[PDB]
Design a protein around this nucleic acid. Structure first.
Ligand SMILES: [Mg+2]
Ligand SMILES: [Zn+2]
Ligand SMILES: [Zn+2]
Ligand SMILES: [Zn+2]
Lengths: 557, 178, 268, 107, 84, 112, 97, 171
DNA sequence: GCACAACTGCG
DNA sequence: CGCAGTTGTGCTATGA
């Protein structure tokens, strides 16, 4: 598969969540990410030094990456950056940005309240990052003037000049992507009566956040190393590399760019409108116009499914798939790709009940047995047997599909000009057929039980169905009305141990759910066990003998 | 996989302010005067002067050769050829570094005999100088207190010009003759 | 929601029940520290019936002629009549059984006798009999001391928590409390001899099994009781088909911590 | 302890923390008619000394957070005049153990 | 921090989980051509070879039983009882 | 404490109604879990998903992105003590089989 | 086939830690990324041939580790970075408990 | 100079080695990896001290494969050069650009310019040399050099040195 | 199609 | 300053 790397192999012990500082975004970035045009060196098929591989990851499958070498299955993407023309909010933090504004003075960047207020020091005391901010906010949202002189911690006769600035504070209410405040004012003490109404610029808010004291934002949710409030407002944009937004290159001459590759081009275009718009003869209205648009493009790229309607619909009516939407539950990254997964070494078929199978076994069709494989390692113990299975080929029942050398290289017994003469060396792996008596995980969805997934013994059988013992129907919730079930094959000698030693059907016999057995004798057997056990019921020797023989443990008495 | 040390510090995200290292007695993080060991105790940094150095490797490779044969049960130019033998016995050969090191050490050792090395260490270690200076004084041969204070500029006001000279005088007397 | 709410809960190497925070949910899993599979609904015989029939069943009085154990029961019976030192032991024995009764009656207020507990004591004696071909005629070789004390000594070895300190030692005592009530119920001097008719050999075996069978019964540190419990409540909720909101929707109300519940009654 | 008939004005309510280390308690006479602690479902709550608490945390290799919490306003916590940080031992009868000891740290 | 041998508290018996991972570990190791500390009495399945090893208590592994607080008690496959 | 009692009673009465029997311990755990925190913690997106548990763990139910957003916002640190985190990380979880570590002791490896 | 969320649950219930990792990694997603020891991000330029390992931005050429995570996680991570969030992966701890 | 540092390397043994000469193999594998090694952190790792007493520690068996990782705690003689360190060495190479001096395991180079003006290169010399009014520096020539700066390169450290100041140069 | 959680305004 | 009243917001079984 992937190649040897000298790098010390460890495990992720902690995950330290933080925020990107434009500085980092710049540093880590292998390219910027200047032109919306994907590739085609002016129609000439190969990537452009502008978007996707301006030193980023790679396309072509052949033709390795421009930063590391390795290529495709090895190379995780290499990050990019676009230097935004004007600071823009992060669609997500937009509410917290408002709440931070509501906490601090919009002029000197000092907390509206401090250690001088008792209900404030009470909140400043709260141990929890989130609960603390929540309490601070509730007290600070009420303060509409940055105090110059507060009454002393003893008398209201003498006043202490706690902090600078006297300025009146706005009443910030959001106007979707825009934060617009309404200041009280004064005018012969009266005003308001008719206040002052202006939108607060991303840049102004950013400048207030930059001036927020380490200790002040530290009292708020924030961290001086990983999450400074100023980092909620975006200046430098990380450009995710091809693997995040794959170019589905169907046939030779035909692209097929991902949704994100499109939305980025849109952010890029909108940024270049604004870039030149302001530098040149800035008609100052089309300036805040091209801005609101860039703010929209960066908003909908991260979240398209926002309150204030506009679905940023791809020219097809179909709305653009936001990154937020990608990770969003039951299907999509977290819920459906990580917590749940599609798996190799799995099988499914119709289940039919068998009276001649021991409780703990499962009838696996010959086809399924010949498809699914187990990686056995050439050991003096097996060696000879494995050579016979290799020799036998992938088409017989006991046989093998592949042989894996020391040189981690796969031999396809199915084709290999050597499948006949192939001398196995110890330590090689032989991916052989699911043979009788292997542990396997048998399963029936839904799966509300420890017992809805049990470990069975293989028994390779003819005919296309999975055959299971009737008594084990009850814990799966199976019936033979046309139900299908799943089979998972363990790959490790250690994993086989897990199933055998913990998940086995004989073990699962007495359920802790009810402190009573979960399987019993059922149907034909249950009806017949009464029918046989009545006093009126007697058996002649002829049948008594056959009935005795039939019990495999019979003592011959 | 590389090698790690007792120095357990955790610079989280905070890359740099990686100090320039000079004999302004500012050795690396790794080479701090105050440091730990496998036993978990604090211990003063170990610095060797050649010969005090040459004898360590000598000893270690000898006790190693003891075990290489224990488990296998069930005059300057003249010492040079003798050392090249011990290296062929206990070292991987691929370690051409230790060979060059031993040849250098053999020819550049100020004090041959151990008795002498022990006595050098007593003389210099009483001074209260930093281990890198107690090292440099034993390895570098000086006459003027100025010769010393120039090459080991870390001294300067640390020692008396006369007192440093008294040391240098006793060091030349100990100097094992070839 | 049930699984997602509990997933991270397991039994740690200190018989404690914690989550990813290591925040204690239960001090000892299911108040007793036993694996649910190793439980069987057993009868606490001490609990009910007349105080008169209780006395008949449990009381031994070597000082009274009509209330001693007949020398038909044990060999020692003839030489036991009047042993004041022994009547002291049978007095603790009886005064403890009397104590146990007042406790069970405090715990199970309705007088419910049948409770699910570990170690099927009924079956052990059953097997002791078939195993040692117990003669319900010839007198036992057991001593009053053999019984009384061997049972004392057994309880001491019925370990759930292990720690050497009052905090832990007292949690051991508590977690075990109810089982030993049943153990004392089934292993009273009169009961062991009259009913069971055990020999010393048979009795020692009964005890040895109870000990190791109990030990088997305890939870395994590593046991993923978060999901185990969540699945065990959730699963039967699937098989779900005065007039108060019941079943699936009431369960929905309970888990949701429904403020505006549908059928709120007060039973005065 | 102050057993007020109908109500206390927010005027007087602010005078309760004014005189520490002395602590004042307010109780509506109407709540006190019935002793909540006597109820079927209400088990034994036991105040633990600084040393008693210290040992519990030592013995279970605990941090105060890890412990199950009783709110400051918990009827039984008010009954015993629980202060934040103070731990209670809860002795409930068990349908599995007979007797079960739980512990609650204050809020 | 590491609980000393004379202060261990955990079950002197082997957990259902311990035994399963112990057996799986030797089985994996045995299969990976590791050295076998028992007489293979014609045995050929690493699990059976491992079970035989565990039975003769000739498995050379140690269980680091971690406690909620982080500290641990090291127990040996030799010293652990197998009532299972 | 009386709320826990009434909560179990109510929970038990739902299961027992359908005839069905669930061993005490199970329903007791659910109840004990909803109880511990201090009051009644709802088995909902704004109840158990509130607690100080891992952000990668909580994101795996209900407010998925929003949780992860607020993670980086107030620089949360994942313990990776939770099952879910290990599942996301592809690590062997500290569950049953993974609740302890296994080591070869050279002393005993030379004894045999 | 699908080793769905629900199947993970019973597998945990079972205490089958290893069979779960095997299902979730080896029999699916399993992938190898290089991480920086300073900022725990997949920033590393793994020229694993000349053994060159670098995280420019961190100036690191020393503190690099290799981790095995599901490719869907590498993705989820790059996906979060694309959204200005840093999911820093660290191979040692600090907190305790 | 020449330090002694208490280091530790993590070695992952394959199961095939979980035999009796295990400690034996681990000790030898440490020496393979560790000796002759060169990091910019610790410099040249030259000799592993106290082979008899190497602390093996227990090795945790790795999750999905059978190999077990051990942290092999040790102590060794190390040479890490410093800028401003004065070293006595022997000349090796010598050209129009300067001369490269052998100091232990490492090579210090003195630029034509980092020498006095009186010392000038002799092209027409067998072997090549630098000639002062008084001194001659060719090959075997023992020298004293002030290390001006170090460059941590691959599995070696190199340096640029001075023989211009007082008490430096030919010895 | 609910069930709650923020938020907001009049007594 | 409090509580009624609203506006707001996220979820809605499991495999083909
Ligand atoms: Mg059906
Ligand atoms: Zn690349
Ligand atoms: Zn201000
Ligand atoms: Zn980095």
């Amino acid at each position: 598969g992937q190649q040897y790397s000298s790098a010390p192999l460890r495990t992720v012990k902690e995950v330290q969540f933080g925020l990107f500082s434009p500085e980092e975004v710049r540093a880590i970035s292998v390219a910027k990410i200047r032109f919306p045009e994907t590739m085609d060196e002016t129609q000439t098929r190969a990537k452009i030094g502008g978007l996707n591989d301006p030193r980023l990851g790679s396309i072509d499958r052949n033709l390795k990456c421009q930063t590391c070498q390795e290529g495709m299955n090895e190379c995780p993407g290499h990050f990019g950056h676009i230097d935004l023309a004007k600071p823009v909010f992060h669609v997500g933090f937009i509410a917290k940005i408002k709440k931070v504004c509501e906490c601090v003075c919009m002029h000197c960047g000092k907390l509206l309240l401090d250690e001088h207020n008792e209900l404030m020091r009470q909140a400043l005391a709260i141990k929890d990052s989130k609960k603390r901010f929540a309490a601070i906010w509730t007290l600070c949202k009420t303060k509409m003037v940055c105090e110059t002189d507060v009454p002393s911690e003893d008398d209201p006769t003498q006043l202490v000049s706690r902090g600078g600035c006297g300025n009146t504070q706005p009443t910030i209410r959001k106007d979707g992507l825009k934060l617009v405040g309404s200041w009280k004012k004064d005018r012969a003490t009266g005003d308001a009566d008719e206040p002052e109404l202006r939108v607060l610029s991303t840049e102004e808010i950013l400048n207030i956040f930059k001036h927020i004291s380490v200790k002040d934002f530290t009292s708020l949710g924030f961290n001086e190393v990983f999450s400074r409030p100023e980092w909620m407002i975006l200046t430098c944009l990380p450009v995710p590399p091809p693997p995040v937004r794959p170019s589905i290159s169907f046939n030779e001459s035909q692209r097929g760019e991902d949704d994100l590759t499109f939305k980025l081009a849109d952010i890029l275009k909108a940024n270049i409108s604004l870039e030149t718009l302001e530098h040149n003869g800035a008609p100052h209205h089309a300036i805040e116009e091209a801005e609101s648009l860039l703010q929209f493009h960066v908003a909908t790229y991260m979240d398209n499914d926002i309150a204030g309607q506009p679905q940023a619909l791809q020219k097809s009516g179909r709305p653009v798939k936001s990154i937020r939407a990608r990770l969003k539950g039951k299907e999509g990254r977290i819920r459906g790709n990580l917590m749940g997964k599609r798996v190799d070494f799995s099988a499914r078929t119709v289940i039919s009940g068998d009276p001649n199978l021991e409780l703990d076994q499962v009838g696996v069709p010959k086809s399924i047995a010949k498809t699914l494989t187990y990686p056995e390692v050439v050991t003096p113990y097996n060696i000879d047997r494995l050579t016979q299975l290799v020799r036998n080929g992938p088409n017989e029942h006991p046989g093998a599909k592949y042989v894996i050398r020391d040189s981690g290289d796969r031999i396809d017994l199915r084709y290999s000009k050597r499948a006949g003469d192939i001398q196995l060396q110890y330590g090689w792996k032989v991916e052989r057929h699911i043979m009788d008596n292997d542990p396997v995980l048998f399963n029936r969805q839904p799966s509300l039980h420890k017992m809805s997934m049990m470990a069975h013994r293989v028994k390779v059988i003819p005919y296309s169905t999975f055959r299971l013992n009737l008594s084990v129907t009850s814990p799966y919730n199976a019936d033979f009305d046309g139900d299908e079930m799943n089979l998972h094959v363990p790959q490790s000698e250690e994993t086989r141990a897990e199933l055998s030693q913990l998940c086995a059907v004989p073990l699962q016999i007495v359920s802790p759910q009810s402190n009573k057995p979960c399987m019993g004798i059922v149907q034909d057997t249950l009806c017949g066990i009464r029918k046989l056990t009545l006093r009126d019921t007697f058996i002649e020797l002829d049948q008594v003998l056959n009935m005795l023989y039939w019990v495999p443990d019979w003592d011959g008495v | 996989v590389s090698t790690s040390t007792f120095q357990t510090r955790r610079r989280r995200l905070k890359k740099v302010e990686e100090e320039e290292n000079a004999a302004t007695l500012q050795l690396g993080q790794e080479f701090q005067l105050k440091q730990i060991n496998h036993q978990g105790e604090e211990e003063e940094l170990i610095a060797l002067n050649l010969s005090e150095a040459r004898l360590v490797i000598k000893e270690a490779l000898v006790e190693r050769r003891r075990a290489f044969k224990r488990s296998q049960k069930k005059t300057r130019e003249k010492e040079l050829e003798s050392i090249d033998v011990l290296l062929e016995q206990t070292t991987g050969g691929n370690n051409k570094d230790l060979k060059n090191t031993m040849q250098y050490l053999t020819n550049f050792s100020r004090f041959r005999d151990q008795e002498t090395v022990g006595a050098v260490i007593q003389l210099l270690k009483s001074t209260g100088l930093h281990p890198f200076e107690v090292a440099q004084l034993g390895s570098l041969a000086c006459d003027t207190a100025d010769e010393a204070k120039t090459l080991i500029p870390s001294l300067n006001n640390k020692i008396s010009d006369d007192e440093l000279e008294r040391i240098l005088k006793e060091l030349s007397n100990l100097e094992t003759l070839y | 929601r049930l699984v997602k709410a509990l997933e991270d809960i397991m039994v740690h190497y200190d018989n404690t029940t914690r989550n990813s925070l290591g925040n204690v949910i239960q001090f000892i899993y299911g108040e007793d520290g036993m694996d649910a599979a190793h439980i069987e609904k057993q009868s606490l015989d001490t609990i009910g019936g007349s105080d008169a029939a209780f006395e008949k069943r449990y009381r031994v009085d070597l000082l009274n002629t009509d209330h001693t154990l007949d020398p038909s029961l044990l060999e020692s019976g003839s030489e036991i009549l009047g042993d004041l030192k022994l009547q002291v032991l049978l007095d603790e024995e009886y005064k403890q059984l009397v104590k146990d009764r007042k406790f069970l009656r405090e715990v199970f207020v309705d007088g419910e006798a049948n409770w699910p507990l570990p170690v099927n004591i009924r079956r052990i004696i059953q097997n002791a009999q078939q195993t040692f071909h117990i003669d319900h005629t010839k007198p036992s070789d057991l001593t009053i001391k053999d019984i009384v004390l061997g049972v004392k000594d057994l309880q001491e070895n019925l370990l759930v928590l292990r720690g050497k300190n009052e905090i832990i030692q007292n949690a051991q005592r508590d977690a075990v409390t109810l089982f030993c009530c049943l153990l004392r119920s089934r292993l009273a001097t009169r009961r062991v001899l009259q009913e069971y008719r055990l020999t010393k050999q048979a009795f020692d075996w009964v005890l040895s099994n109870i000990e190791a069978q109990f030990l088997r019964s305890v939870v395994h540190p590593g046991e993923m009781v978060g999901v185990l419990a969540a699945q065990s409540i959730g699963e039967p909720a699937t098989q779900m088909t005065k007039k108060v909101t019941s079943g699936v929707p009431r369960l929905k109300e309970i888990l949701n911590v429904a403020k505006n519940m549908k059928t709120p009654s007060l039973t005065v | 302890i102050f057993v007020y008939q109908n109500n206390i004005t927010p005027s007087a309510m602010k005078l309760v923390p004014s005189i520490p280390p002395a602590t004042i308690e307010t109780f509506n006479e109407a709540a006190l008619v019935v002793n909540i602690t006597h109820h079927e479902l209400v088990p034994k709550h036991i105040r633990l000394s600084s040393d008693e608490k210290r040992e519990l945390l030592k013995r279970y290799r605990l941090k105060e957070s890890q412990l199950p919490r009783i709110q400051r306003a918990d009827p039984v916590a008010l009954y015993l005049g629980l202060k934040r940080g103070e731990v209670v031992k809860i002795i409930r009868k068990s349908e599995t153990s007979g007797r079960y000891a739980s512990y609650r740290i204050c809020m | 921090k590491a609980i000393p041998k004379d202060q261990r508290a955990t079950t002197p018996y082997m957990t259902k989980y311990e035994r399963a991972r112990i057996l799986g570990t030797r089985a994996l190791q045995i299969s990976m051509n590791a050295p076998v500390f028992v007489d293979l009495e014609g045995e050929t399945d690493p699990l059976r070879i491992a079970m035989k090893e565990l039975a003769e208590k000739k498995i050379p592994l140690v269980i680091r039983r971690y406690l909620p607080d982080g500290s641990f008690e090291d127990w040996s496959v030799e010293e652990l009882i197998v009532d299972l | 404490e009386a709320g826990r009692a009434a909560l179990y009673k109510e929970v038990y009465n739902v299961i027992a109604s359908d005839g069905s029997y669930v061993n005490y311990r199970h329903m007791a755990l659910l109840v004990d879990v909803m109880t511990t925190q201090g009051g009644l913690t709802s088995v909902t997106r704004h109840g158990f998903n509130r607690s100080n548990t891992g952000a990668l763990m909580r994101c795996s139910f209900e407010e998925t992105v929003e949780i992860l957003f607020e993670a980086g916002a107030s620089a949360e640190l994942d313990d990776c003590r939770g099952v879910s985190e290990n599942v996301i990380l592809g690590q062997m979880a500290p569950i049953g089989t993974g609740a302890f570590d296994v080591m070869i002791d050279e002393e005993s490896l030379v004894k045999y | 086939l699908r080793f769905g969320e629900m199947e993970r649950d019973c597998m945990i219930a079972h205490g089958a830690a290893s069979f779960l990792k095997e299902r979730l990694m080896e029999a699916s997603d399993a992938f190898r990324v290089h991480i920086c020891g300073i900022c725990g991000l997949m920033t590393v330029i793994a020229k694993l041939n000349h053994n060159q390992f670098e995280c420019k931005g961190c100036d690191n050429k020393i503190d690099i580790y290799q981790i095995h995570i599901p490719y869907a996680a590498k993705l989820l991570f790059q996906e979060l970075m694309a959204m200005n969030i840093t999911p820093r992966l660290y191979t040692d701890r600090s907190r305790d408990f | 100079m020449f330090f002694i540092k208490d280091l530790s390397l993590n070695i992952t043994l394959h199961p095939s080695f979980f035999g009796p000469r295990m400690k034996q193999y681990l000790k030898t594998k440490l020496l393979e990896e560790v000796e002759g090694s060169c990091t910019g952190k610790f410099g040249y790792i030259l000799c592993v001290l106290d082979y008899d007493n190497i602390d093996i520690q227990r090795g945790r068996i790795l999750p999905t494969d059978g190999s077990a990782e051990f942290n092999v705690k040790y102590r060794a003689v190390v040479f890490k050069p410093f800028k401003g360190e004065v070293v006595d060495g022997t000349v090796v190479s010598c050209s129009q650009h300067g001369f490269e001096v052998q100091v232990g395991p490492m090579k210090v180079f003195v630029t034509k310019h980092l020498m006095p003006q009186d010392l000038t290169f002799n092209a027409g010399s067998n072997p090549p040399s630098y000639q002062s009014s008084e001194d001659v520096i060719t090959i075997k020539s023992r020298i004293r050099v002030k290390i001006e700066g170090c460059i941590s390169q691959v599995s070696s450290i190199h340096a640029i040195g001075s023989i211009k100041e007082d008490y430096l140069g030919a010895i």
